[PDB]
């Protein structure tokens, strides 16, 4: 998957 904004 999928990252978050602040990564």
């Amino acid at each position, epitope marked *: *998957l*999928e*990252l*978050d*904004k*602040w*990564a």
Partner: antibody
Amino acid sequence: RITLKESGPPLVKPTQTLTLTCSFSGFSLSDFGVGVGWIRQPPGKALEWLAIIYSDDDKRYSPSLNTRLTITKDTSKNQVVLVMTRVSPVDTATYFCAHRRGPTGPVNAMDVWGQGITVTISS
Amino acid sequence: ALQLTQSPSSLSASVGDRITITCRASQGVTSALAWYRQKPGSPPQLLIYDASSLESGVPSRFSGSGSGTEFTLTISTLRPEDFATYYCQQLHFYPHTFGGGTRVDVRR
């Protein structure tokens, strides 16, 4: 400082729709980054992440509850609404809404939570 | 899908004891992991944010460490108000994920 709170019907019937509402006050959804998510906790089990909505409107749901959840924000009231459809006894739990940060690095954690409003399903 | 299964899952300790509870992640989550203490009756409380940062207003006895896949949250000295359930949450991947919970009850 920041305090959110949960509203809605404590008692809900199998099939229908559960509309919960998070009223916060200490921040606005106009502040940049600021997010408000929904976390729910079955009777005596663990926390389960539901969905999150940010200042500028993106929204990520829970892959497993995606086709049943809908998150919105009305910036004039400072409430966040979460609609979860076709509920069943398994959706009986305590639902929390929480405030997440915004870059000033510590936008890394849900720092303040509503107090919780426990919903129970039962026709 | 981002498993993360928190170790020691039901401590049994006294006041003054020193315990270290862990939270494992199936995929690296930078340092985007938070720790909470919930005490029956109410909502989760933030203790550690960004894996190692003590949240303002939280007792100095709580501390956090780790990065990537391993994270720990130590209680230098166990207080009465510490007997509760603790949770870890990563906010690096969507969906944001909570561990199963570790609980520490009074030992007898």
